[PDB]
Structures are given as structure tokens and as C-alpha cells.
Design a protein around this ligand. Structure first.
Ligand code: ADP
Ligand code: ADP
Ligand code: DG2
Ligand code: DG2
Ligand code: DG2
Ligand code: MG
Ligand code: MG
Ligand code: MG
Ligand code: MG
Lengths: 459, 459
């Protein structure tokens, strides 16, 4: 039993006595103390004229914005810090706040580690365990199949080229209760080895297995359930994974998220992935802006037709620069890279990609690697339709080129090995669309250097 | 302390064992029982071949949609009803749910009186006291200055013409702890009477005062603080206002809201006001669709340039009919009606209306009532600029025509009475833009008849 420190957000669209009654009712609760009050706008009542008049009558310190027509975001942030608030309680309404303004206020309050709540809603700030004994980056994103894993694999290779030994702790959508370690820095991960793991009941197409193969690195397979609006998760073993990663042979750590969910482990720096294919409201409203606000570097992905228009790409770029002008921003597209040789082969291509981009990926594969793609399955995520596509194409291909994602091991690899084909795993590589935005390796190196410098200087 | 019945929302983007662990963790909590699970979509992490395995392995009943690509909204609603669930717990994430899908799920769950919550968020359903002993309508809206009061005054007069005696309980953002009673059916409310009230410290420009004067009815002045996202309020005396309304001389009750807030008293039927001037996201996302879903009749307001484009008005109409197909929908604009005679007089017009629409209101006043508008103040909300306009124009006018809103009594009426002018109070009348949408009085009568029929039969 200890009191929670509450800041009240109030407005001049309410008459002061009903506000005073509300603050006295909140303060007179057991386990709550109202420590400050912020007037967030409105002027219908100005009979009480002076912040010191309001403060005298409340017996609480009272804060106002420089402009009564605008939400005093900076004053709310400064007040939550100054009074070290546990809770910010919203006693406002239209016209002073709409949903957009509430999510803007929420994004500030939750970042300072305070609860944001009102009459009918509550938001919990992200728990964040300070457990890593190595310099580190978080790789998070706004959704699924936007390239969090693809960017993470690439970043690991860049960090290796920079003469560091990276470990990826991947927060996946399942896995053993004790996090599993994959020594992709020591072990030759083949199709037959992945099937041997799948036969033991191991989730061999998970991101830790993919990053181990695609980037030849040590990885730790963690699990989670649920992924909230702000990005928190219901249960996870990622804290245990970060503890494991400390003890193993590595000298840089990537904490990689899943879906819109954020690993609850403190890192020196953060890379945020944003698919230009996603609705603008998911990027510029709700807790999109909160996620973009965490970034040192933003990778915008899917920056091409048919996935996004030029105007959409420019709108996403413009918004990111407005809300996070400190962040470096790189717009990108994904292109395939086989982890093996496919030159002059008849190729069956297996992917999770949208059907509208398969033609472009095939055109690229044939033009660059000199293969002939005899058939495609975009159904790695759908086991019945996958088997249908395999029976159609399997006989006319020399080898199957597959993403190491979804049913790629226990269905597609199994069928291809029993049919006597070679199986080559396929990475997705982030390629910069526009050289005016500079080089993606240099952008990652900048963030890696910041993470190392931060770790050396802060204890 | 009593056990709360929880339904879990789960997906096939999580591997079964981490979902099972999550459900066992939730069920093993004190005063929570997991009673059912709804599988809301996704496929790739289903190694389970038969959906019956899922329920067998959880030891919980599990319900599925007909289409694994779509959220089974209907199944969620049917299960919350069937189990009389207190909580719905979201153990999903991107790609299966985005923010929009979560607000669609929230709107269903909260309407059935269940909490909706996830990893980092919680939403509380509306408190609703069952206290009225008379047939009744709630008049609520999506914002401020969208015409809730204007529609409410009109509805009261329509109910009077239909041979009933209506009472308006107005939930404002201010007023005495004991609700204030105004007998506008028995008292001739003059400018001098309103100044006598303002000098006693009464909020004479409040909605209960306005409805009393504009509609010559009994009204009860209630107060509240805060207005949440769903529309709940932190504190209010509206329960006491409804108890007062039962005792007094009336045979129909209108419970009128304020801002986006909803009076927490049960009513037979609901009228929802939606300003077409508001951003589409506030109408078609968050808890706009929840508010529109409460409606028997939706009044769309501000349906003209400069406030809304024809395309906007059509988008609002189309959306409302999609989410609430049995609701009657009437698109409208507001025009002045003096509560007195202004024919051939020199008029100083005082309003809270935007500068961009004053010309249309003036053009209407002069064309309909044959007055000469010698000047306008759009500054009833801004006491300094109001006095500047009054000093300029007061000498030119025979009478001041004013909305009974904001500084209309304690500044504008006071200056006009001391300057020896007549003061005429001005209603805002909802006018239907297109006769193909039918007559607004008939639309109100339909809802009033439903409220009377419901009241007679639900006893
Ligand atoms: N040019 C492209 N346009 C659109 N999608 C692409 C393109 N190239 C690859 N993809 C798809 O992008 C996705 C990247 O997925 P992944 O790296 O697993 O990201 P995440 O961790 O965000 O799910 C895959 O589904 C892949 O097939
Ligand atoms: N034609 C019009 N276009 C736009 N606004 C108008 C028009 N006519 C009146 N108004 C304004 O509409 C508002 C209606 O306010 P009111 O009836 O108090 O509704 P609420 O209770 O929702 O605030 C007032 O500010 C009034 O001046
Ligand atoms: O499940 C899917 O991805 C496709 C079906 O794939 P095909 O059977 O057309 O290959 O759904 P659709 O796009 O037809 O609505
Ligand atoms: O706050 C309230 O009591 C009412 C009126 O405000 P005022 O007209 O008294 O400023 O709000 P609304 O019905 O306009 O949303
Ligand atoms: O407050 C307002 O609406 C007016 C007041 O100034 P005047 O209209 O009295 O000049 O300024 P604006 O917003 O048009 O710049
Ligand atoms: Mg207390
Ligand atoms: Mg991934
Ligand atoms: Mg329990
Ligand atoms: Mg009103």
C-alpha cells in the first residue's frame, strides 16, 4: 500500500467548481495523491483569472500553456517529469480534445512511464527491463510482412562487416518456455538439418532460425502472446533471452520484435520499420507516432508500385520528419537473394509475398541470377493451398527456392526433399530506392556507433 | 469481490502452446474465470488439422468464424451475450487486428456491457442508472457546437405539438450540486429576468435555460466533469436530475448530453447528432461508430458549404446506413428563428457561429423576417472582442438579436438593456436540405411513439 502520484488534465470548457469537486474526489481516494493540475485549453470560464488563484482554491500547483487554443504537450511532458507522476487523469472532452489529441497526449505520458486514463479508458506504459551487459539495438515495426526480420538479418551482416559479433534475440509468436539458442555462426544449417529439427517439434521457420541461416550468426529464440496498441505483450520470456545473450559469445545484441509488439528490454538505440503499404491512420494516428518517436533510424519499406504510390511515400516521409526530425530516414524496397546458386536452374519459388508483386520478384530473380522460374507458390502461410501449388509445379523444377518462413520447412522443404529436389533458402534484401537519401549500411553503422558510444559512457 | 467471466480473443498467428499458457495464466487469476475463447483469424501457426483439437487441448469451449480471413464480429457478440461475459481479453496483434479492427471489436463488446482490454489498454462500458418513471429519449452527439441543444429544443416543441408535456434534463459542464429547475412552461423568461439570474450568479446562458426559453418547457440543469472516448463521465448529478424529473409536472423526458459525453441514465430511445464539419476519423473510427450505433434517429448537421462538401455529406450518410441500417438518417443545416418579432427593424445580430457562415445567417434573417442587419458580432465566446463589436454597432440597431449562449446575458444583454435596446433571443432551427430525406418532425414523432410504446410494454 503506497500512493500513486496523479496529474489531472482539466479545461476552461468546464465551470471551475465541478473541476474542483472532481480533483477533491480523486485526491480523497485511498492510494492516490493529486500532485499537480494542467489546464489544457478552453476559455468559456475566465472569472478565475490567474494560475495562482486556481492554485490557491485547489491547494494544488496549476500549469497553463502559452496558447489557450493549443494542447500544451511540452508543459504536460515537463510536469509528468517534474512531479514524477504514476498516472495522468483526463477530465476533458470535445472540443478541447478529440481522439487524435488524446492519442498525442497518451504518446507523451506513456513515454515518460506514466499511465494515461480518463472516464472510460486506461493505457499502460511499456515495461522495460535494464538487463543487457552489451551494446544493443531494438528492431521493431508497425505490422507483419513489413520487413522487420529482413532489416534485422541485414543489420546483423552490417554489424559483422564492422568487426563486431552480433547476437539476435528474436521475440517470436511461440517457442519453448526456455529460450532456444541457434549457433548459426558455427553450424551449417541445411534443408535436411531444418527437417531434423522440425521432426523434434522445433519451429525451424521462426525468425531466430531464419536470421541464423540468412546472416550466419548466433540467435536466441524467445516467445510472446498478444501485442497491444502501444506495443506491450501479455506474456514473454524475452527478459530470460537477454540474460542468456549476456553469457554467450557475442559483443553486440539486436532485440528483434514481432508484429507491432516491442521487446520489453532496454536497448541503447532503436530502428523502426514502417511499411508504406499500411493505412496512413496506423502511421500518423493511434500509437504509430509513438513507435516512430522511439526511432534513431526509420526504415520505410514497400516504397514502390503496386504497394505504395509516390504521393503516399512522400506523405509517410514528410510525417516522420515532422514528428522525429532527429531520426535518419531510409526509403527501401525488398529484392530476393538465394542462399545458394540457382544459375540456369528450373526454379519453383515459394514465398509469403503479396500476389501483386510475384511477377516483379520472378522478373528480378531470372534477370539477376539467370534461373527460369517454372512456377510460384505465394501460399507458404496457407498449408492446404501450398500442397495444391506443390503438386502442380514440383515435377518441372530442378530446385525449390523458398523463404525460411511459415510452412517452408514442415510442408514445402519436406515435399521437395521426398521428391529429391535441392532446396535453397531465400533472403529478402532492403534496397534503397533513392540515392539522395544515402546508403543503408552507413545509416545502420551510424546507429551501431551511437549504441557502442552510449554503452561505453552510460552505467 | 465476485468472479468476472472472461472471453479470450486468440489467433492462428500465435503457436497454440503460448496461447494455452496465456489462457491458463488468466484463468488461474483470483476473481477471473475464462469461460470461452473466440478464434478471430490467421492460419500459418496452425499445425492443428481439425478445429476440434483446439477446444480439446485448452479444456475451454472455442468458437470460430465462417471465414478465417475476417474478424468474426457476430460470433464475438453472440458469445459475450451467451456467457454474460464481464471482460473480453485480446491476445492478438498485427496482422490479424489493427487499431481500426480493435475499435470495431471494442464497440461490440462495450455495447454488451463488457470490458474490452489487451496487453496495454482497457475500455470500461457506459454506467447507466435505470431510474426514469416516464417515456424518454437521450439526445447525444459527437462534439461541441454540432447542434445537440438546437435539435433538443426542436424535439421538445415537436413533442409539445404532439400533445405531450416534455421535460429536458440537460447534462452541462457546470451548475449547482443540487440540479437547478427552470419552469419555462409557467414563467415568461425575459432579458431582464435572465440578468436578474446572472446577478444571482446563475449560468443563465446554459442549455436548460436556453431550452426553457426557446421551447417554453420545464428543464432541469445538471452538471458533469470529463467526457471519455466511449462517452462516459467522471462525476455527474444526472441521476438526481432524473429523480427530480420523475416528481415534476411532465409526461416525457429528454436526457440531453454535452460535448461527446452521454447521460448515464437509461432511456427508451436515442437521437444522435453528427456534425458533417468534424473529421471523418471521428465519425467512422474510434467510438464514433459506437455512438452512431446507439441511434434510432441520426441527425447529420452542418450539411452545407463552407462547413462540409457534398462528397463529405454523402460519405457520412453512406457510412451511417452501413453500420446502422435500421436508423432513420436526416441531413440538416441550421437557420435562425427569433423568439419574438424583428420585422422591418434595424438588428444587431450576436452569435457563436463561425465567421465563414455569418453571411448566410444574415442573408436568411433579412430575406425571411425583412429586418436590416446593421452589424454582427460572432464573438459571444470572446468577451473583449464582443465589447469592441457592441461599442461599434449598438447605436445603429433598434434591437439586439442574440443566441442564448456563452456571454449573451452577462455582457451582450447587459450592454443592450443599459443602452435601452430591446433584446430578442435567437434559436437555431434544424432545416432538412432535401425533401427526399423526409420531414424532421415526422422523424422525431416516430422515435417519440417508439419511446411511448416501449415504456407502456416494458412494465
Ligand atoms: N518487393 C516486394 N514487395 C512487397 N513485399 C515483398 C517484396 N519482396 C519481398 N516481400 C515480402 O516482404 C515480407 C518481408 O517479411 P519479413 O522480413 O518476415 O518481415 P516481418 O518481420 O515484418 O514480418 C515477406 O512476406 C516477403 O515475401
Ligand atoms: N448554418 C450554420 N452553419 C454552421 N454553424 C451554425 C449554423 N447556424 C448556427 N450555427 C452554430 O451552430 C452551433 C449550434 O450550437 P448548439 O445548438 O449549442 O449545439 P451543441 O449543444 O452541440 O453545442 C452554434 O454555435 C451556432 O451558432
Ligand atoms: O487465399 C488466398 O490467398 C486467395 C486464394 O488463392 P488462389 O486459390 O486464388 O491461389 O484468396 P483470393 O485472393 O482468391 O480471395
Ligand atoms: O458545456 C456545456 O454545458 C454545454 C454548453 O456549453 P456552453 O454553451 O455553456 O459554453 O456543452 P455543449 O452542449 O455545447 O457541447
Ligand atoms: O478571434 C477571431 O476569430 C478573430 C478576431 O479578430 P476580428 O475578427 O475581430 O478582426 O480573428 P481571426 O481568427 O479571424 O484572425
Ligand atoms: Mg488520496
Ligand atoms: Mg519477422
Ligand atoms: Mg481465475
Ligand atoms: Mg449544447
Amino acid at each position: 500500500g503506497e500512493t500513486k502520484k496523479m496529474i489531472c488534465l482539466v479545461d476552461g470548457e468546464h465551470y471551475f467548481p465541478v473541476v474542483k469537486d472532481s480533483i477533491e474526489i480523486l485526491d480523497d481516494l485511498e492510494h492516490i495523491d493529486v500532485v499537480a493540475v494542467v489546464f489544457i485549453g478552453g476559455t468559456e470560464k475566465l472569472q478565475i483569472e490567474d494560475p495562482k488563484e486556481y492554485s490557491e482554491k485547489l491547494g494544488k500547483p496549476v500549469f497553463f500553456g502559452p496558447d489557450p487554443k493549443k494542447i500544451p504537450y511540452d508543459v504536460i511532458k515537463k510536469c509528468v517529469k517534474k512531479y514524477n507522476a504514476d498516472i495522468v487523469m483526463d477530465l476533458s472532452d470535445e472540443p478541447v480534445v478529440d481522439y487524435t489529441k488524446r492519442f498525442r497526449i497518451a504518446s507523451i505520458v506513456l513515454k515518460e512511464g506514466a499511465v494515461y486514463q480518463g472516464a472510460d479508458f486506461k493505457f499502460e506504459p511499456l515495461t522495460e527491463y535494464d538487463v543487457l551487459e552489451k551494446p544493443s539495438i531494438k528492431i521493431i515495426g508497425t505490422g507483419k510482412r513489413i520487413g522487420k526480420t529482413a532489416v534485422s538479418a541485414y543489420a546483423a551482416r552490417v554489424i559483422h562487416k564492422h568487426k563486431y559479433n552480433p547476437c539476435v534475440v528474436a521475440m517470436g509468436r511461440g517457442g519453448p518456455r526456455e529460450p532456444e539458442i541457434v549457433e548459426g555462426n558455427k553450424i551449417e544449417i541445411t534443408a535436411e538439418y531444418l527437417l531434423e529439427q522440425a521432426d523434434k517439434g522445433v519451429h525451424a521457420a521462426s525468425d531466430h532460425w531464419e536470421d541464423a541461416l540468412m546472416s550466419r550468426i548466433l540467435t536466441v529464440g524467445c516467445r510472446r502472446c498478444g501485442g497491444g496498441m502501444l506495443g506491450d505483450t501479455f506474456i514473454t520470456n524475452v527478459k530470460r533471452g537477454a540474460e542468456i545473450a549476456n553469457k554467450l559469445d557475442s559483443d553486440f545484441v539486436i532485440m528483434e520484435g514481432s508484429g507491432a509488439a516491442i521487446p520489453p528490454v532496454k536497448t541503447n538505440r532503436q530502428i523502426v520499420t514502417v511499411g508504406a503499404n499500411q493505412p496512413m491512420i496506423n502511421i500518423n494516428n493511434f500509437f504509430g507516432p509513438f513507435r516512430i518517436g522511439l526511432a534513431d533510424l526509420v526504415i520505410i519499406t514497400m516504397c514502390e508500385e503496386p504497394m505504395a504510390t509516390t504521393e503516399k511515400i512522400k506523405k509517410v516521409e514528410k510525417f516522420i520528419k515532422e514528428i522525429n526530425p532527429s531520426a535518419n530516414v531510409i526509403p527501401t524496397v525488398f529484392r530476393p537473394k538465394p542462399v545458394g546458386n540457382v544459375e540456369g536452374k528450373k526454379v519453383l519459388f515459394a514465398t509469403t509475398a503479396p500476389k501483386v508483386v510475384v511477377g516483379k520478384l520472378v522478373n528480378y530473380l531470372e534477370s539477376k541470377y539467370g534461373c527460369d522460374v517454372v512456377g510460384v507458390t505465394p501460399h507458404l502461410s496457407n498449408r492446404p493451398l501450398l500442397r495444391r501449388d506443390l503438386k502442380k509445379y514440383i515435377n518441372k523444377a530442378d530446385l525449390m527456392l523458398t523463404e525460411l518462413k511459415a510452412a517452408a520447412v514442415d510442408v514445402a522443404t519436406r515435399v521437395a526433399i521426398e521428391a529429391g529436389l535441392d532446396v535453397v533458402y531465400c533472403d529478402n534484401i532492403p534496397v534503397v530506392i533513392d540515392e539522395s537519401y544515402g546508403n543503408i549500411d552507413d545509416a545502420i553503422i551510424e546507429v551501431v556507433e551511437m549504441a557502442i558510444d552510449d554503452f561505453k559512457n552510460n552505467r
